[PDB]
Amino acid sequence: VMMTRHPNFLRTAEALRPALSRQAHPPIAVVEAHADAAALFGWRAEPVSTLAAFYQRELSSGDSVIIDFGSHYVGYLHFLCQSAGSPPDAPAHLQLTFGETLSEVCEPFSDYQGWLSSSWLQQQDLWLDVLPAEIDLPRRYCFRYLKVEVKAVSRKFRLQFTQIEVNAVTSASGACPAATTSDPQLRAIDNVAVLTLQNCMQEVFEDGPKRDRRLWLGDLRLQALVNDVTFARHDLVRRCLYLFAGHTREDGMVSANVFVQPDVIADDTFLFDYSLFFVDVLYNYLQSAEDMATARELWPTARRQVELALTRCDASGVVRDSDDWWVFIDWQASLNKQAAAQGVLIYCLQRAIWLAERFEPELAVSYRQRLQQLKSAALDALWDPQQGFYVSGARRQVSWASQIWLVLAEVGTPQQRREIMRNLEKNPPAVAMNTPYLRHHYIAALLQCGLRDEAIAQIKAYWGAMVDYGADTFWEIFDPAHPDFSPYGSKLINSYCHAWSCTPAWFIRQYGL
Amino acid sequence: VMMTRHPNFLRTAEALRPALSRQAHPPIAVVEAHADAAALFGWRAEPVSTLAAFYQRELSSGDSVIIDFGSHYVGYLHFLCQSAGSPPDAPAHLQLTFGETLSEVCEPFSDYQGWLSSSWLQQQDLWLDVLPAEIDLPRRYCFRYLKVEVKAVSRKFRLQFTQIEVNAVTSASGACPAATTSDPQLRAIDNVAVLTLQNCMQEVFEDGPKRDRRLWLGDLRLQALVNDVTFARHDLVRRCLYLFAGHTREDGMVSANVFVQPDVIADDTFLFDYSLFFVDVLYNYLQSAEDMATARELWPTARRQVELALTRCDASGVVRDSDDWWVFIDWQASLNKQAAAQGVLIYCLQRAIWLAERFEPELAVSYRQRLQQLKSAALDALWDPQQGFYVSGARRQVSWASQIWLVLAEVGTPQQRREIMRNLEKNPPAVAMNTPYLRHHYIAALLQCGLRDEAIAQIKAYWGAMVDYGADTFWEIFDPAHPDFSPYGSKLINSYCHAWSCTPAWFIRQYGL
Numbered sequence A, B: 001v002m003m004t005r006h007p008n009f010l011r012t013a014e015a016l017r018p019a020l021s022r023q024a025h026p027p028i029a030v031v032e033a034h035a036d037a038a039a040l041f042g043w044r045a046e047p048v049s050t051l052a053a054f055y056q057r058e059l060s061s062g063d064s065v066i067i068d069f070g071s072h073y074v075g076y077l078h079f080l081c082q083s084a085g086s087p088p089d090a091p092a093h094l095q096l097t098f099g100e101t102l103s104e105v106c107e108p109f110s111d112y113q114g115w116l117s118s119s120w121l122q123q124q125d126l127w128l129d130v131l132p133a134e135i136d137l138p139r140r141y142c143f144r145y146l147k148v149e150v151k152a153v154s155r156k157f158r159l160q161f162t163q164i165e166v167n168a169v170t171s172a173s174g175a176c177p178a179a180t181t182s183d184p185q186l187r188a189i190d191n192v193a194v195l196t197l198q199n200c201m202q203e204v205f206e207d208g209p210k211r212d213r214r215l216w217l218g219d220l221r222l223q224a225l226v227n228d229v230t231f232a233r234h235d236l237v238r239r240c241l242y243l244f245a246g247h248t249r250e251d252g253m254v255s256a257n258v259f260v261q262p263d264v265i266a267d268d269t270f271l272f273d274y275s276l277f278f279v280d281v282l283y284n285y286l287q288s289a290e291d292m293a294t295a296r297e298l299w300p301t302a303r304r305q306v307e308l309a310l311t312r313c314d315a316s317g318v319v320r321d322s323d324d325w326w327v328f329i330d331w332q333a334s335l336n337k338q339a340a341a342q343g344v345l346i347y348c349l350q351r352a353i354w355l356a357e358r359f360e361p362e363l364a365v366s367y368r369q370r371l372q373q374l375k376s377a378a379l380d381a382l383w384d385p386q387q388g389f390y391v392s393g394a395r396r397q398v399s400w401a402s403q404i405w406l407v408l409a410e411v412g413t414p415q416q417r418r419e420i421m422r423n424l425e426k427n428p429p430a431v432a433m434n435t436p437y438l439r440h441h442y443i444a445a446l447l448q449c450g451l452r453d454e455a456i457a458q459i460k461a462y463w464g465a466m467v468d469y470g471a472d473t474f475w476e477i478f479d480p481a482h483p484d485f486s487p488y489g490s491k492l493i494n495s496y497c498h499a500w501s502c503t504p505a506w507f508i509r510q511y512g513l
């Protein structure tokens, strides 16, 4: 897999690396876990003591506690501990376990049976040869709960903690305007959304601070919108644009995600939709930041994503389907992706035209003709009048995703599109949405068709459910009908702070809901 | 338990802290373990590749190897490793296990049952967030074999080690005269002995570098003898004398062992014999180093150990017996210790007299009378003519230890004592010796009675057995009839480099065997 580096673009990205603010926080309580069928993933917390009382305890082999930090934090653990009893005559062996949910410190990691690496699960053994001890752990953890287990000391002495804190980090340490909304339930959702984005904003826009700690293009697109009306760090959107542009496949296609440690390496994973989203991110960045220099410099990268995407169309102007993981759309293994991909192409071509009008007017003429072909081809090949929905693939599957994306693409007439959104509400497709990522687009489609009250009710029903369940930050994965669901094969390795799920802040602020 | 600090003595000890020499060593092979009934603790090594070939390997989840370092080392692990395949998209989770014997990296630590802390078992989990990686582990390990297990990486990449070394440490980095002996089997034993002492000589004379990494008085006594004819670091014997003298029980009794991290703390463990051995260590130090200043300064400490010990005698001059752990002698739970303790008292009183002659002549007069009382009382109460052995305790137990110590004490006549050592041949006592520590004294008793050929044969039979089994260093525990034996409950937590077992070097060199 041949790649191409662009030193000029990478030097621009490097110069825009943000400083991180570091800030200490103590935890709020010691708790005990109780298995409970009717709770957040089967486990309930009960407060048992303050921390001042825990600092008086003298722990022996086998003793363990769970520390509730009170909110969701990303950062570095610091603690002090010391001996009690006789002079300490052996190392103290501890085991630490970190969780975003309570369930992550109650279910054993040894039972994880998924296709992501188990190494993402947060855990650390320590051997203290000398007491008293001052410990600053080097790895960055993302957690609310911390389990501390004394695996082994000798019978001659006991261990005693005197201080525990987390040093939390973020690049979103600037001001953040308060939301106007007079609706208390939307306010609560906005608060959770903003915290979600804050913890994801680091040296790049990370998708999730526990996992994958990495810049992805689909995620970036949504995060940039929220950033726009919260922390307004346009320099960081610019940095992330130059990163994707600075290291590409040799034919010019941008990667789905980028690493920045130990140096900038772009992944060998390529997605039809994420590539095209480079165009929409560049367009939204121009609108919000008003930086013509950057948009002009990066336009060729955007244009190239379109040149390459258009080669996937057959003679009749419909995107070819295949069984490999060629486009993302949602975490839904049974989803045929052809129709949704057609919609993404048409959506992003439209933005390529708006950009072309400024930087390459002559090309906009032919792009406009091409837009028309694709929309017509979508109607001819994909629309099914009897069902009132678009079908996808050789077996003519009906999904939510197909409808959402072809409505956003503005295929057909405004009243046809409004009729489709009513059809979802009264006659729901079989293949459902699994992520707040895809739900974001459902909301956008509702608003675009002037269904404003329906969009408000939908934000409240879906994201309000996560809030009512007790979420501090919004989740990577959420299907209300199956709250245990994981595409990875364990809810333990899902992310519970994922910024592609924090767009309600944008909807609420931008549309004045 | 009230203690007393002596700042003057501790400042002298601190000023004599030795510099450590650090020196790099590569391992010699990759091996595979095979369960084998007739081998060193049930496990046999087979070489499978060089290290140059292992540095070409690309390891995935579940792969593991065993690295043979070729000898016994004490020090710090350094290695480099890097990614292969796709760009690394998750942390690399490794598990390291360290063993002095092969069995320690083959038997699972999770099965350890014992009264010593399991935290002594050497083990370390690592999560590498970034590759390539340069790793220098901070803890000091004592090992020959190293197991390296890749617990988890993702399917997209593999791990590849490019260098592995141990940085070995010791304070015995000076010259060391070669042994004269023309006997090839004694030469082999001397080589193993010298390496044993070398690894135990650190910032103090440690009893064992894996465990307990600590200065004990009984161990010190034997280590100082060997030091005398090998590395000749008298400054270190002096340091260790001032440590025991510098922090005592409030009534003046020295502790059995001393900690030196984070500061000097003497243990709350007190042993009749180890306390008295302060006298013999001071005496041997004067003979070898010729340092009258130190011996004069520390004489009051020595004298006080005798004052206190003599209070354990009844009116008739026999030491009172009890079932608590009041005296050490050997790791033998079934041993009645009264007779051996009587012998240790008489042995150490004799040295207190030789010291008193120089620093307090008037006291030697009464000590000489007391020596006579104790020897007489030993004959009257403990000698059994019908059996030709000394008995110990109310149940008149016959042990090896009783005979050994009362012969070293020079109770009775030279011929009586020679007849006792012959009797150990013809009617071996029921309660056997479990350590090379006690065996050292058996050898000394043989030599003292002029049984020189028998002492040579006994060094060869016992220590030669450990060599023939494949030992790089001599062991803390060794009963030939039960090689699996542990007073701690698992052979995993025994020490396999214990300097109280390296005295053959002294015997061989000092007596020109």
Ligand SMILES: C[C@@H]1O[C@@H](O)[C@H](O)[C@H](O)[C@H]1O
Residues within 6 Å of the ligand: A207, A212, A216, A218, A219, A328, A476, A500
């Ligand atoms: C497809 C890509 O990878 C998944 O693991 C994460 O959910 C990420 O947010 C998504 O954009």
Ligand SMILES: C[C@@H]1O[C@@H](O)[C@H](O)[C@H](O)[C@H]1O
Residues within 6 Å of the ligand: B207, B212, B216, B218, B219, B328, B476, B500
């Ligand atoms: C009794 C004392 O402690 C044991 O654990 C060690 O074997 C040490 O060497 C010994 O001197």
